[PDB]
Assembly symmetry: D2
Homo-oligomer: 353 residues x 4
């Protein structure tokens, strides 16, 4: 299942009750999984191995009630939508959508179907809207040229978002590959106490990176040890309830790369590594016109959040592997789930259980 | 009718043959205009006042033969698609599409339709593709909530790209507003001689910014003079044949803001001002594995290009006004074309012309 | 003097009482001018035409009580000191120092002299300090290789800082050139009302850029009209405001300064170090703060007036740097003449603008 | 000794002959170590524990013959000089100097003493010069307030620059602390073959970060294993390579340096000044060049090996800075022990290493 149930300890901070990004009160996650067909690749028909994942900053109208946010592009061989305004205004005003590289257009169409329905004032009595869509390429297993994600799928994922969500090869992670093993959706969280108050840092990742040899789990070179085992980009979403300004949240997003690096993420040329981070502490009203007060921790005290963020991403990445199920896709390509029995053998070998 | 016609001098460099971005050998522009209905607004129905404009770096295959590119975001209240990879790899691998803010999704779909058709390897034997889509909000005259742009329109605009192209309220500029006058597409070019060699700098703009009183034409406060005339963001595309690296083209893109400002562009909070610059000098092969030789001017001699960029952008913005025609739209809104007759009296009144 | 007293109107917002960056209550400016020698250049000796200019965000301890700040590099052919931390932490914790390109090291030394004197805990019980120094190249008139600026000059400039301050060829502006006329220090301010509240936007510029023919004053190509005026042969913009704004917002404000620059004929040529630094006096950040703080800040949807006021203050500030500059000779008998004001009135009149 | 020879294997790429940044031919490194006094801290007097370290891109005039370069700021709690021009022009035109935070002004004076002496035209017939200076805070062991570094020390460090240089507590690393052990200069190199051609990637670090328990060596939690080990109580990474690359590409390589940092337990806490500077010796840019030049550059699609190698070089270099450091006492009788070699080899073996 997850790292802890296998005796694998990542970091020093304790996890949240769910040990998921939803440990941040109000955060919701929904999926729509699309699996169909088997065999030779039939460009435009299948096999289909993809889906949609939605992340909701909170339970209400994200456009009317925005949240401060930040983001960092470790390597831009990615096709994200909406980061420019996010950086300019420091806010997120729509649910966060994740899907495959060739379905971002479709995703935007679906995300808008949802947004416009919730806000009929957009484009008439008020301004436009900044849909936020990020992705990963699931071409190894999925008929990506087919663009099998439908606009209704995006609305469905949003409406399905809940506190508890499945991990592994579901939603946007359905046909993803990592370390030449089955990748996908992974999640984890951490609790930290700063000047008396307890804050939560959650992480949800869409893993689809690394060569088999790069895999590093709790410092153990499992990847190298699994060199010839059969079967032969990443979006990191960070959420926290700690009060932070948009500038600070860009700092937070950078730290996600620390957890990425520790699992063997080298950010090769073609790996779209991007991190988005937001806080639920300050809600920005779309129509506000008077001076406001933004609650924020002084930078001198947020180091714990920086570390917890690295820890969260690192385990989240590992969890996407531990939760993934073996899978076959286009052209009979197969991606086996990281072999858990062999993994335990290796962890004990390097005395780390 | 353009600046020259009225006898208005902008800058000191001479224009190109056509005085259009297409003066840069190989560059082509195509439009698709959507006009329909009138009267009160009927969301999802009309009146319709929008379209699509496409800019092709060269007449070949853009994905297979990429061109170095740079870009600058003056104010990010914009929803551009594809800038992250552009900055990361310093290249543009698809035609450039412009349209309205709420149709970027559809634009992506339409662009992918064309791209996938031209490249069968994408998503099968090679990686994905980074569609480049920029936009401006035409809500004042257009039923933007209706998303009347269709994916076929994108493909059509591309197939229509030609050396010669219309300006004013066409393509993406169909329903645009500028200085509370009719805005839209505007273009211009300049020739510069650097160390014996002649280079061309072209600019195409999609004007949709400024208050009435902001308008500055060749230094004259035209906006203030016509403050009482009835009718009460911007994308700048820069092209050149001068050899430049991706870093240098980021610099070039910034210089376009010099021209924007001179016409009275202040980059208000809600104005999405973005500039993208590319060179036709170096062709980057998608499948290249051998060391290459990138041709580039030393930075100490490119100041003329920085200037020419500002000039073309400034005149292009003015041209979009001079080439626009009066038009009515949703809720009976109307944008008058800048009265050229009155303009002349004002110019002459300020010692100009 | 200033554009106002000449009838030259720039922008639509009204200026502050003094029409200087110090109209932002608490802000202070001090100068140290170095002029000596004449004739042939004797590298290391003179002629000397340089100086130092200090800008204090407020009147107390800037390190212990920081101000939120932002900045934008239009063209990085510049050697600024202190911007990386400004961007990372969003704050300014030292007075702002301007001087010539090759004196930045000396400026840092002097600035630290002042700072360590005022804070004995630095380097012992607390962290270090991020000195903020910016510059322009005055080589055309100054023996820049000689590094005539002395560390004490930096401390002096800081202790001379106050509300009233001279403009033109003084302090860091002493040996600068702009549009092939004498350049230097220029300043101006604008008042704006946002949601029933008055806010001031002030600007101080160190002009040292432009070709003679680029000069644009209130839309009039004053540069071309004065093509043949004798003397033929880089810029830092400091923005201050009392409006509450976060670091991110102050980076936005910094960018708007370029609009004003462009309007006077600034094209940011290859070798022109064009940089803008913006800060607010509305939110003071205590060095040792540990409790959650409340940052006062205007919603982005209502700050466009500040963007315009910024561009305005910068545009006039640049012109004032020319109007306030007095003719000056320098190394190798090089000379830059002050923009002829009576001539300027004539040109403005010919274009029906006065 | 260094890691490689101790038997500690980091990464999968082989190291250069010296396993130092100078394996990139032409690069040199010089130090000036200042050690004086002991006991209680007498501000401005001592004890002195600091110095200067100079890195030369090549053997000639760096100003007249510049090298292309890039840089990345992981966390800006640093006071670097020269990065703005580096990013704008993509070049380095002076030797690189490292010293303590409060000595940056002195380093500028010193570096300028050297440059102006070697370049008589600067400030007279040509432009100015961009001094490159970076730093770390050695206040725990050194009387930093005293600014004991003198301008002559800088000129000296530059002239002592050699292929063979000492590591550990020398030069700018003299008084540095890492993981609450002795820190300082560390270096390593990796050789990678790309398209039948071998390139070298070297790295020199100045370590001054991390809490005891953060220490990660070859994936082993040595930090936690030495939690209660005595002596309890930022980082600049310099990357060099002979691979041909543009400024943009070198900014990318600079970023990869953080991967190695993270893997040793670098979390970039709030007050940690973590910065990477990368340059190539492949292309020299003539100061007075006025004609179209040809930049030799490797296509991005084939540079991933350099990205991983950069990660490895930094990771091992950080470790070598610890292995080469010697125990030291300083101001206020503070002491920093060198990582216990025998105990470390013991801990490693205890984890199958
Ligand atoms: Cl913010
Ligand atoms: Cl490039
Ligand atoms: Cl902030
Ligand atoms: Cl370059």
């Amino acid at each position: 299942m997850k790292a802890q149930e296998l005796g694998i300890k990542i970091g020093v901070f304790k996890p949240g009750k769910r040990n998921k990004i939803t440990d941040v009160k109000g955060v919701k996650v929904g999926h729509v999984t699309l699996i169909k067909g088997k065999g030779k690749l039939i460009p435009g028909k299948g096999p289909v191995r993809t889906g949609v994942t939605a992340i909701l900053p909170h339970e209400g109208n994200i456009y009317k009630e925005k949240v401060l946010a930040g983001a960092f592009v470790m390597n831009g061989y990615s096709k994200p939508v909406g980061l420019i305004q996010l950086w300019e205004l420091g806010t997120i005003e729509t649910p966060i959508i994740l899907t495959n590289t060739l379905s971002i257009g479709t995703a935007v169409e679906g995300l808008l179907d949802y947004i416009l329905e919730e806000n009929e004032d957009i484009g008439v009595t008020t301004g436009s809207v900044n849909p936020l869509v990020l992705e990963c390429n699931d071409s190894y297993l999925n008929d990506i040229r087919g663009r099998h994600v439908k606009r209704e799928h995006v609305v469905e994922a949003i409406k399905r978002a809940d506190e508890d969500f499945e991990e592994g090869a579901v939603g946007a992670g359905t046909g993803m590959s990592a370390f030449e093993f089955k990748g996908g959706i992974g999640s984890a969280s951490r609790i930290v106490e700063i000047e008396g108050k307890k804050y939560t840092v959650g992480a949800l990742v869409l893993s689809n990176f690394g060569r088999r040899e790069d895999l590093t789990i709790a410092g153990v070179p499992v990847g190298l040890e699994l060199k010839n085992w059969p079967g032969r980009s990443i979006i990191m979403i960070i959420a926290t309830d700690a009060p932070l300004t948009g500038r600070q949240l860009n700092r937070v997003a950078k730290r996600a790369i620390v957890g990425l690096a520790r699992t063997g993420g080298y950010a090769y040329n073609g790996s779209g590594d991007i991190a988005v981070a937001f806080s639920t502490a300050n809600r920005i009203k779309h129509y506000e016109k008077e001076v406001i007060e933004i609650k924020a921790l002084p930078d001198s005290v947020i180091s714990p959040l920086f570390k917890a963020t690295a820890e969260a991403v690192e385990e989240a990445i590992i969890n996407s592997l531990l939760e993934a199920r073996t899978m076959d896709g286009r052209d009979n390509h197969v991606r086996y789930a990281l072999p858990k029995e062999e993994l335990l053998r290796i962890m004990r070998r390097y005395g780390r259980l």
